[PDB]
Structure formats: structure tokens, C-alpha cells
């Protein structure tokens, strides 16, 4: 019904998102949970 | 001088770039100060 010239802007569907309280054994996190459990049994064959 | 019609595709000028050891764990110090800590383990 009517005339559009061609798109001055270009768009989309979008997610938008909310932008961290530790936890409590948040101390291990530096290292893998692979290598605690690993650390485990190397401690138990030594 | 044609007649185009609405955009069927949307793009841009764009960049493109192109895309652990075993023993990784002794890469803090280099292979010669390994060496000679361990001459210097026996010599001590």
C-alpha cells in the first residue's frame, strides 16, 4: 500500500541479557575438578 | 539505471584472520636454568 525506499537501518531479533557472588568452595576453583580427583588418587598410589 | 528490490541478503566489509605440552609445566624457566640447577644440585 505504500512506497519504502531501500533500509536506511538493518536490525534483528536480539537476546538481551542481564551483565558474581563466590561460592562457598569457590577455593577450588583455580584448579580442575579432573585434577583434584586425579591429585586423590595419585596421593592414594603414592 | 536498474530497478533493485529489497535486500534478500544483509552484509559488511568484515575481517578475517586465521584461526598445553606435556612437559608445558617447566616453561616458567628456560631449558638452560633446568640444566643447571641440576649441575649444581650435584655439585652442592
Redo the contacts between chains.
Sequence with gaps: VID?S??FM?LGISIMIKKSKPGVFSFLDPLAYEIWMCIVFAYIGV
Design positions: 519504502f531501500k533500509p538493518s
